[PDB]
Amino acid sequence: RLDELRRIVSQLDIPVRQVMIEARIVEANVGYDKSLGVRWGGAYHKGNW
Amino acid sequence: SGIGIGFITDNIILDLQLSAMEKTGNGEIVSQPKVVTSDKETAKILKG
């Protein structure tokens, strides 16, 4: 029993495997916004948009 | 914005204005999230 348990002991006393996990986050945001306000105002003949 | 003005004052004061606004807005949103999940397990993707 001693010997059998010793063999199991040898198998069990094994280093647990560490792993370095590297996760990369890539975010790309592209925003294009154009606004046009066109004004035609004349108070001379009262025409104003 | 939209206005049409007509004015007389000497004979009579008559001001006639037509005010019109026409607005068109189209918005398209396309969002697609991808999640990798194990079989018969719950996984979530959340952005907000």
Curated annotation (Swiss-Prot), chain A:
It comes from the Bacteria. Coiled coil: none annotated. It is found in: Cell outer membrane. Belongs to the bacterial secretin family. PilQ subfamily. Essential for the formation of pili. Involved in the biogenesis of type 4 fimbriae probably by serving as a 'porthole' allowing passage of the fimbrae through the outer membrane. This is Fimbrial assembly protein PilQ. It comes from Pseudomonas aeruginosa (strain ATCC 15692 / DSM 22644 / CIP 104116 / JCM 14847 / LMG 12228 / 1C / PRS 101 / PAO1). The gene is pilQ. The chain holds residues 432 to 480 of 714 of the full protein.
